DNA sequence: TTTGATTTTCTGCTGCAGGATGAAATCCCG
DNA sequence: CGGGATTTCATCCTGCAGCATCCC
RNA sequence: GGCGCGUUUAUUACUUUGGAGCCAGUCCCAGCGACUAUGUCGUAUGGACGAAGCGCUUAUUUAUCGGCCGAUAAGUAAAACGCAUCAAAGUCCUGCAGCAGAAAAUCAAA
């Protein structure tokens, strides 16, 4: 009773079905074409299939490769010419891609004391359902709907929604008029593609991508206006130099609002320089806290133009290895007159301070631990100092150029046969940087001028040599199918695709995807009704509005007609190709859009080099259950977390009364431990588990979304989440992005409660998360006041004591927090409260949640898991928001704040109905 | 011993923003 | 004189929302 | 960690997550550690090598044995069958940015 396809047949077999209004919910397949090895994987099983299915017919793959290459070159040439358009008129391109308005009418005016920005912003009140007053400016009414007052009512210069088809792409480049000199069908593709589906699909993809860039760039210009004003306010550190009278000036003038992309890098170099000076002279040398000398903020988030402005720094490996070796052997003989030179102490000071001698690597972890291959050279230098400082440098050079020529004769014999050693590259680069930072120390003590150019050259070469043998080439190539629809003529396929299903021998189909992108016909059709056991070839082409099947006559030929067979499981077919409830060839599910994706899948025998051809048809629903369900006895309190996500508590609607996804953080920390082991040695990633973390995350998210939906439907529930303000995370030092999934569970539960009919108003509500998961279920803290005294506090009611066990190690330490209080209190108490912060010990012991699993109240004396008690309050906070009793009227009229109103609601209900 | 602040090279995962194109109207060519 | 390939065109949503929640 | 069977997820073979089965050794090159230090000995850290179900049939091959066969321990070669071995999930694309991981430099701090 646990499956997700039993709950949907419980939902859609209880209440009625309504057609959708304007659009529907969208799903999609992700199937794979039978390339070749999907036929090898069938003649290796025990039980062999009866009919060997089909493959790509060896000339469909050639045409598909030609189409994908020509499509990617066309899309790149269009984004090139619009990049050269965008680099001249930012506001010109922004005003070009604005939108049409719609088909409105005669609106008002507002030219009186209001224009636009950088041209006569009128006004109207269209949507009279609830919220009206959309601006809708003009000059083709560019819907300039914006402004949030704050400083001044500044409506946006271009629109609020950039659009896809605002440009009318197909009167420019593609058509045979329009002397704009870059026509991608007549120049690059070679005039052999139809100007029907290719031009419109290329319009779809290129205008979608440039509208994405512009609609991000507008918001980023506004946010940098705020951040540049805030950065100009934080040049009160120019006061802090005379506030301490010991620092002269940082001497850096901030450029204005940058607008381009290189202005951002210049302004960020200036903010980086002032931030480096602030950390060097005001957080360490004078020991100020961070909120006394606030740092300058960096301009983050500037979007670049999509495909034209990638990085492309690709270099070979062996040329940079020989370059590093040339730079090292150029400075050898001047590197002898320094190390056989200066003193007996300055050589020891350079060895000691610049991290050469082994500081503490002697802790045998049940052999000594490994060294970072700069201190191996320190051990060798110490031993060759002991047994043997003039002739030591020659004696410690020959045992490195035998460890470099020993490694470089191990790569070059194990790279140029078949394999990649993948660790003996990283140890060669580590040893070359150690020998580099050993030769160059004549420069970093004698004259520091040409050191930093040589140091930035060695840093660029080390970066190339460490990362570049692990970069991925071969980005994904894709070609759009923009719909299946019979045109205005009676029998002609617009957009030139189908979904074939050639009939097989017994009764079954084979589900091909015919593309016909050549500049001819070769696919035509009349109609069909019989199931004759051969190539009936039926088709599904949406004649007009209603769906239809046809019968289709064509010969598989070597001039067009890319015929891809599909290979999907029985589960994808049972869901949405031949489903019993929403049947195709009737109209309840319509197809909308297809692709052909050639992306990289990891093959088990070799590395990741295996491009396979996915298809990904996108399906829209058109039958949807109507809401006549209320779910009374409901109040399921989902209360999300990170150590154990989505802990559940169920309760009756008066208030009176599971650990879904139990072991998840341990698996993710083990996968990150495996990546951090294969990153310390062997500098890259070993790209097998470069897609393990997202796959495990999606498996847990969709399994727990199934479990929440099952517990919502069967126990007749209304899921009450907590308003975690989408995009919530720890965002600290050791948070990997996979463990940041409080938004994705709500997203998947909504996107499975949008499909199968409902909305986010009948099985998914949301309460406030303010002061939940902090109040005990028999008590009511917020303000830990140590105003009362250092022998005791008074807590809520009654009193308390002291005598503690305060644990705040950050090494291996603790206290007792009575002796600590006395030592930081002496015999004055109040003066110690004014000077020192003794509240840290109070909030280290007397705080709730001592270990980050449990929970102890301060007036109850209670102990519950703080997740099965974070859930019985989320369900009791939604029953406080929308239940107008007495104490929701208060905090709404403004008598009491939220904490006092909620505790006066709780301690009124916790004795009456245990709510 | 370990962490502040800049910087060089790679990677993955989430979080936004475009989307999920049919109907009609010309026009050329056998 | 129709068949079939090009070439234009154009759509729509309101909804209200308050200072912790995650974890260290 | 590696290698394979594969069942349930109410016409097919995809992408995955779980449970169960079988192997995890050799200093050949390297890494790393100790030193009796331009190398010797250890350590399986990476490459390269080999290890990777069982059982019932049938054609064989080695050896025992009952007077040209036939039963046996073991291997080869072939197809079907049973067991170990059982449950779940899928909404994509393009484009950026943001975080986080990783070393490696430079200036400093406790």
PDB file of C-alpha atoms in Angstrom, chain A residues 1 40 76 106 160 206 246 323 364 368-369 425 495 508-509 542 549 604 620 628 637 667 693 901 908:
ATOM      1  CA  UNK A   1       0.000   0.000   0.000  1.00  0.00           C
ATOM      2  CA  UNK A  40      24.658  -6.111 -26.360  1.00  0.00           C
ATOM      3  CA  UNK A  76      26.639  29.936 -31.183  1.00  0.00           C
ATOM      4  CA  UNK A 106      -7.475  52.537 -23.252  1.00  0.00           C
ATOM      5  CA  UNK A 160       9.728  43.598 -15.476  1.00  0.00           C
ATOM      6  CA  UNK A 206      18.392  31.353 -28.610  1.00  0.00           C
ATOM      7  CA  UNK A 246      48.484  54.847  14.046  1.00  0.00           C
ATOM      8  CA  UNK A 323      58.380  25.001 -19.030  1.00  0.00           C
ATOM      9  CA  UNK A 364      51.731   7.268  14.518  1.00  0.00           C
ATOM     10  CA  UNK A 368      54.805   8.235  10.379  1.00  0.00           C
ATOM     11  CA  UNK A 369      51.967  10.014   8.553  1.00  0.00           C
ATOM     12  CA  UNK A 425      51.145  13.419 -11.966  1.00  0.00           C
ATOM     13  CA  UNK A 495       7.646  20.862 -37.183  1.00  0.00           C
ATOM     14  CA  UNK A 508       3.034  -4.881 -29.394  1.00  0.00           C
ATOM     15  CA  UNK A 509       4.736  -1.718 -30.598  1.00  0.00           C
ATOM     16  CA  UNK A 542      -2.580  16.290 -33.081  1.00  0.00           C
ATOM     17  CA  UNK A 549      -3.774   8.641 -34.715  1.00  0.00           C
ATOM     18  CA  UNK A 604      31.737   1.069 -16.289  1.00  0.00           C
ATOM     19  CA  UNK A 620       1.407  17.870 -20.535  1.00  0.00           C
ATOM     20  CA  UNK A 628     -13.821  18.733  -3.121  1.00  0.00           C
ATOM     21  CA  UNK A 637       3.492  18.628  11.142  1.00  0.00           C
ATOM     22  CA  UNK A 667      25.873   8.279   3.553  1.00  0.00           C
ATOM     23  CA  UNK A 693      25.875  12.699  -4.524  1.00  0.00           C
ATOM     24  CA  UNK A 901       0.659  35.769  22.673  1.00  0.00           C
ATOM     25  CA  UNK A 908      -4.376  28.256  27.964  1.00  0.00           C
TER      26      UNK A 908
END
